[model samples]
Target chain A: KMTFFPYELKLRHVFTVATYSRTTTPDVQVEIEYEGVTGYGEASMPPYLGETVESVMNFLKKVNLEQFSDPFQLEDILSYVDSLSPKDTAAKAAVDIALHDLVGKLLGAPWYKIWGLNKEKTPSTTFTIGIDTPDVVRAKTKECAGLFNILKVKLGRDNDKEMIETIRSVTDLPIAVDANQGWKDRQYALDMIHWLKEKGIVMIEQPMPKEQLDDIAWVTQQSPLPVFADESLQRLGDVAALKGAFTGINIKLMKCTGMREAWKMVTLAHALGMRVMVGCMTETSCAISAASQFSPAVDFADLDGNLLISNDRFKGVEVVNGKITLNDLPGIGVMK
Target chain B: KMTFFPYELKLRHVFTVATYSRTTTPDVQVEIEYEGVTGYGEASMPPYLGETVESVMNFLKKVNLEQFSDPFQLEDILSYVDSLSPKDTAAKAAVDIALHDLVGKLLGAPWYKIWGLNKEKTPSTTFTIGIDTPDVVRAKTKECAGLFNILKVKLGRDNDKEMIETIRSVTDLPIAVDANQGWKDRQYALDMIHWLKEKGIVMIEQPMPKEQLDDIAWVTQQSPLPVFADESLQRLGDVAALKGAFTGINIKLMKCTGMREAWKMVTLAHALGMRVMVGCMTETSCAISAASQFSPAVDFADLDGNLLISNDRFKGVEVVNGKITLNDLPGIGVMK
Candidate 1:
């Protein structure tokens, strides 16, 4: 009923964040078959998730789909998969996405349609430019010139100002900053956020470390721009806990166990009077397209993970003038 | 095309709450025709909503459904309907429900299926025994014997304790109390909640007056049982505002303008870490079924409105072994 294999996503550039840099991201591709229809999914193994290809595949191998005859038993199947391991969210996501894909295809409708959401309401996805040298940052900005309307600059280092300054020189487009929990001092984070707001930064993500709620809450209370929780928020449980500390949350399929939990996070965040953004990891169109299904419901989106990769195994989800667009095809809207 | 007519649902007995008693509930039944398919809806007018048959009909006449070619354009259509009037939520709900029914019919699926919710998870329908004398309350309790597991008792009178004592003598079933903002003093309200908790009460709803949030919040802070907002929460805007003051909220389609806003309230409430309950006013199964579509996603269900009335125009939503059970027919799943 299911098959998986280890794979690697080659980054177009050396993907650099606040903590590290990498040329390739380890991943595990999954496929679930039911009634002659095949559904595709991917597990992106980033350093932060602490998952590798071996770990992901081993987790995937233990999943037993034969216990359930219907793929639409998404809740039961996902619950079973989650119970098999404690911290293998990425692996669980692979099965979750694949099962959703399988079920959606069986129903012959895209998830947005199934969700009763409008595709036209999708916000413009911010193209991410990871932390890099000023020259490289400018070059990256040029590459996204007319393609993206907004940009997300990775910060969290001494060169954070340089990163924004470099992009500002090339484009006047609105930008969102992800500090990757880089800033330490509450006053410094607040001061930097104020300065960044003056530089046209629309939002801030993970300004201080994940565990420093008091400091981030102090910064968020007075900051001009709305702050978000990325590293600080991982699953459904974290959404409520981060209520006062951040303006919203960044939901990634890999972190929250795919569309099911990600969708709940969006609902929970909105109910809490908080904003929601759908982010992605370095993978192929498989994961990006899966995440795109619920993009219309969120406030912000950083879904350029597929765009940052040199090799894409699936063709799905197009960005026209930076707005995430969903194809009419069912089940994550992907084609191999 | 859309058509509507005024109707009256005769109560089996004089239905009473904290403030008022009525023998009949004014209603407007609506039908939307797309091609040859017919979809049904209803607008139930209670005194608190400040709507009469005339006001509801006048509001309905102003709604123009011809401008939208597709019933699936729910967001746009609902927005257009809502813009026509501000306070006519019941009238807007009529159009909203009719449109959802039509769209679900066009898609050939029940809304619960489309919403990706499991019908089996629907909570038990709480049989409501409105505030009455001991004899009448005992008769009502005997009428509901073995048919319902949970009971919602109306309070907010000097006879609040008498009402519970009467019900306790008849049945020891778990009770949920709706004070309807009748309690005046914060200390008294807290004391009543404590007394009610001792009697195996499950939850409390609107202990103090709607405007007296300070008193309600004070009571909620020390209450052993969960507190909910019924009168204090009417629509989507009230959900986020009532967060710290109540443990959860009672979402009625009539108050929130129908399924569209009610669903949003559920999502928002869950996001805010608040519980959700789907409640209904006295109406036919048409409106009750529309609300029932989302019952599986909520924490409580007080959907026995149709059961209280002597005349119900449509057949939908059955209660079996105390749980709300949904029919398999498309749309709101009602049959004439």
Candidate 2:
């Protein structure tokens, strides 16, 4: 089927300073429409990647509207769109999701089923907390207490110890620490690992800079906490090399760009005996809903994009509590 | 000194697929300007890292422009920039070169002078031939006959023999090959090494994927050609760990981002007894000119971005008979 609908959307977000995680609360919303139905998605441009609304808009202007017609033929569409050098992943994601929505309406099956998944139930996702003073961390934990089964804490800064201690004070559920490449030296990482061990941390990610992978391997061998690779594994080929260095990987759609490549990564990583955690950027239901198709095949799910935004523009998947419920409609399943 | 330029160019480039070293060339071009002096840089957005122009541009735009005012503060600026998340080494490099130009103008010194290098002599750079049909490769080599001193042949695809054989037919100079993660396994890489060794090849880089460091180490220990780490090393901290695995490291300003950090990698690699090669992206003169500052301190140079483009923008650095002559004008020393 050939259909072309390309419209620009503007969204505003507020930055939520969490105790263990920094959340960008959406202030404005944007949408891309195809046919009469609109597939909704969110954009959370992290300061780390230097993405802005203005820059994202500039990137979207370069997308060829003609290429948006066939949603199922992503590879062909991507080949044409990629030639244009679309630099905004969020923008690309928005269009990608919108096409998926249009395709779902045409196909009459839910988006997850098209990707081969059972959509009756939602997947388990982790709630996040930013590094902060112990008192503030505890207060934030209490606010969201009992809402999630697992808590992913952001560590690697000055308040790492206090942050972990506070989270421990709130819940006994499984906990993980994402250093986000924060530790300076091997010794400091070892010290943090030992502390995490005492707290029974499930995993630690990119505890130190990627340059120190050897040191990280050394620590992984000694630390009680399971080590996962974040910044360390950007591509699937990176998995074979990181096999023994880390036990798990955090797979973000933003990092993978397209669904076909990410699916290949999932199969390869799983084959190589590594655990997978499907993650998302600060996007709305459209992006998370697409990722939901592969959620059941992985060990962890961190698709919390819609929750981060106060004003979500478009909607696709439903997040009940911390769980994401995939709809039965075709393509990505959301129509507005 | 506080100075702000009248004009700023937020240049963006699209990625192209070219056959180089029997690998895909997903490259980016960056040109930034302050006042009327525009500086250019190149970043080879290797698919191995899943990098795109969108990610690269997002990373570059996040840089704080106010830091470029002080000429002596290049090191500080590099440090600050490196601390950002989702580090895109090449994108960071475009801004690094621009800042180098700004500081050079502020101090009335060419970039080379700012780095304490002699400005009269031009440094030698290698000319490269991509992996192609044997006849095409031969024709391309002939095009550069007598034009370049060192010829780098891209290898690591199915036609390793044909590509090398063609280059051998055209040049007697020391030939280097970059497999760019092409060899499927260690045995294949070892077999290729033996053939190249018999042909008198000087060096090879990343004969296997970056994950197979152990294989690289094994190859480095046994292969006749010295192995250089291109995909394996991004920051200074990676040098020591890759000690026994590879004999050399390719330092791209895009990877190190600036002269300050690049200098650290050079000296550290040299101290660790590793040969250093300074390479560039498909960029214009801005990055190549800044990279030339450390050319005297390295063993090999691969700054060829200016030659790849049909239109040379932001002129100053020129390749005279294959040698990159340092400019005498302040900032990058060469005026566009």
Candidate 3:
């Protein structure tokens, strides 16, 4: 039997930024202590399912904080925790990370081992460059050139072509673009995608608006560049709904809002023969660090949230020359 | 030159209910008049997009109300309208319906004629019964007896078999079940579906959890029941992904949130060899009236919100003896 110790945390910052669409950046600070050792985790509540920081905090407060005594109780804990509607995905994610960290400490094993992942090979992650002017994008790409093996550029209507050209000028590393459902018409999207294909762009995400999925399917059937669904693909039903329209999906913990559901999405995507990219929102190292444990199971990784921000609350995961190494310390094992 | 008289309206009610999942019911009421003809239109907002009454009203207030003057200025009107982030799909839908109403009156033609729908043929709509006790479900089914031809039962978990058995005892009409991604395990969902198929259930919607879409795909490949994607298929990209998994799709204006986009979805689904079911959230007659214009192009229909609710505000469409009759009034053509 295990005893549960649950506490409430506050939002250090709510980072709101414009991608192709509006995005909410949550930085939640969580503390979990067991057996005299304190494990720290941080998560961002992305505006998925309309989850806000206040709502997520309220949800965490409602959780029966007394039920977590034994490490085995995590299954029940997560099951119960997920039953409530999670408005703040980041807060829920923080609790999940802390629980995993707690379990890792008890087992004296890494979180990857607990989840049945290979620890021998270091995983490669994609670094993202937000939407900006072409010159600025080029500068940002050049600055982070050696830090990542794959570059994920955020693209919308303006400067997409010039941005791609600028990134291509710097390096020949695998480049991907996420439109976040910002493109307007079918013809322009098709023309731009064809141009990207000619320039050796690997993949594009939700290039058109969410409602113009027919155009997306049309683009998929003809375009040389592989298309992935970000906003278009949320839960498992999305994978089933978007099976043929795109070659890949970007799965985030914020979308799933829980560990078990996120795992189900990843495994189900693999089973459906779709390429998976395990991604995260603008969170501290806590959420990304937890997501990284499942890195080997995915085709791509977008787990660089901690590195993107200047003042991340928790200690970030170690990334050596575009390769990420899982920490041996207990419970997400990141020190605050 | 068309003189536009646009006025603001207050939110009357935002009713919410949880059957399989928590669904916020929005009834956005707006009245428009052109050249002595007054028309009322209502639109429903689904909570899945995180929209509330306050947000929807705020969105409408932020728009430039003067754009409504030139009825022919639809392109500019849509440009400004579409520029706003649509948190409340129903609110956007209300504006779409109201604009169509205004345009129909201006053209001196009924809304159906505006869309070029069949004037003589009336569409049959499916009545929905949410998840409840077997006795209560049977009672409700019997109460709606002789009033509806097709009955859609909401199912997720908790005595689905008994509920179906009870429903069968009350009615012999075409029966369908919407699972709403309630079941956790795929095998259990398959078993329930197999049982429903044996009981002559005509269709099933999202039988397993949305995340277990692989299971849904596998089941679709083998199951005898015709599967449809409701929560699974939201946008156009979803149509391609759900090709093999579902035989039909439930396209609601609440999901597409735009008339042009909804039209695209219908066209896309038709092209992909998949059947379409035009559905609606719990709304007044105004929104349902708009959906009825597109009813001729779809294979199945679920536009019974007007008949189900007791306190409907505007009356336009008529459902006589289980068939919905579109009014010949300008812009959705029915005058309530």
Candidate 4:
């Protein structure tokens, strides 16, 4: 039997957005050790994920790990976990990442290295500035200077233009905008998309609500910059339904159940010819580092979730001069 | 606030059949007592209903009836409960039936009376006898003599001939055969249906499997008796999908959300030129009586759930020598 333990991790910054905000990202770290080879997994539920501490706890309670035998039953074990909670992706992700970490430890290689992925293929990590006043916007933008070559700006309020102009005042770096689904009007969204390109915007993320795909697809056809789906895209099942609806999709570990399913998402999105941006929520080095392991497979990376937090306990993937760096150690490569 | 109570009802005999078998049925009785008026509801989960006690409990916890002010918001309340669990028809039925009863009492009428249904239009119900030895079958057949006018024999175990022979050795009453998806070959199934109809079988239900609808349709085209669907028809949404697949549908409150949705299904199935047969699981009089409230809308009645069990708690609708006798008592008419 696998002895289970759980705990919570507090986020340094509130993941403030259009629809919701969160002060603490409740998390549960999991482990399954066999023959002295310990594997670790972590569940990071940002408030936007709509999961509470108790909800995640109850979800894990229903998971019977005693039914599963080994990691070789990866598909079967993960499939069973998927059905336990209807929308508890974060809870499912905890078990998924732990299994992946255990599999890597058994093989004695870093996940990215085992996949024969080039570290150089990983795009520069984007530092994000939450929706704020023009002054706080410029301050957050200036803080990321020289460290990252690119910046991902969070928009979707009435002061979206001001938010962009203030960041543009500080840096000439390419900016990717995530509206967090605040924009409502399709026409206004298309007009804003045209204006954003003039302000050096590289891409758009969930400019409108997630429910209506046809309207979003209409905007995608008119916008020169690629329209990315953040809240709109969830799991592999979603990728096929979302084909030709958006130019790209933002794959988040907290939403896709974890690394194994995320791996399938990236592979499927590639086959469907959709550009994938592997993104993250406010998480620890354990999860952000785990996400970085598959960064090479994606066209873009936003692996700065750990960098956004001040109290990270593990060190696995690192960002130097805005570039993602992979460690040579086995498993998720987190150091003491 | 509504009061919730759960209980287990033991069947008179083990509900032994080809696909699955159960001896006890778990049920939840719900009541919304308000302003000196109390309305009753019941939810019963047979083995194949895919609901357990824990699942129903979890669903009930998510339901916040405190937010609701009026029972007229029955549609809104039921919609909220519907989202609580996927495919938990039995759990949803518990809340659904209670709300309908509460609303009907508030409106000062029963549901069937409120709908302006003719009580005389309702059809006679068929009693079920699960698979057993020839002597036991003969004994069970003889037991149905004075209680039920028609019998729904559980076939598809290759016991069609022996069971029919044993049943004929006992009674000359009309028999309705339920295959329960146990029959394997389509050709053989169609041939047996012809044999059953000549031997005085009234109808055939779910002859093959639910998924092989093409084969079921082919059999329906060839069979003389009305071909009904049991597992193939789930909720109001499934009525349109199963149109050309079968001649009639077996509506069970445990499969649909409750009487409200089942009422909608009756209208939809009739519009689609399909026959509607109201069926029941191995339940107590609570749910069996609840299902009987809207039985007038269907063409056939298989309301033998309470009769199949010995421990029925409520006495609302009674079968008098195979005829339905609905009480004038309000709501579902099941009184303590």
Best TM-score goes to which candidate? 1
The sequence of per-residue lDDT tens digits that candidate 1 reaches over residues A153-251 is 878877878888889999999998888888999999999999999999999999988879999999999989999998897898788888898999999
Clashing pairs in 1: A268-B271, A271-B268
Q: TM-score of model 2, chain A?
A: 0.82
Q: What is the DockQ of each candidate?
A: 0.31, 0.01, 0.01, 0.01
Per-residue alpha-carbon lDDT of candidate 4 for residues A175-283, written as tens digits (9 for 90 to 100) = 8888878788899999999999999988888989998788998898888899888889788677766768888888988899998778767755654567899898777
Q: Give the C-alpha miss distance for residue B130 in model 1, angstroms.
A: 5.0
**Global lDDT of model 2:** 0.65
A76 in model 2: Cα distance from truth in Å? 1.1
How far out, in Å, is residue B199 in model 1?
A: 4.8
Across residues A228-284, which tens digit of lDDT does each residue of candidate 2 receive? 888887654466577678777877766665454466566556545677878876665
Locate the minimum summed-lDDT window of 10 residues in model 3 chain A: A1-10
Error of 4 at A5 (Å): 81
> On residues A1-336, what C-alpha lDDT tens digit does candidate 3 reach at each position?
122222222323333233324323544565666666555555565554465657666776776646555433454566577777634555666667676766556545555544435544546777876556677767878888888888887777467777778788877888777777777877878888888778776778789887877888888888787778888866545666676777778888767654545665665555456777777777667777777776766776778777655556567477777877777665565666
| Candidate maximizing DockQ | 1
Which predicted model would earn the best lDDT?
A: 1
lDDT, model 1, position A126: 91
The interface RMSD values of the models, given in order, are 2.9, 25.3, 27.3, 27.1
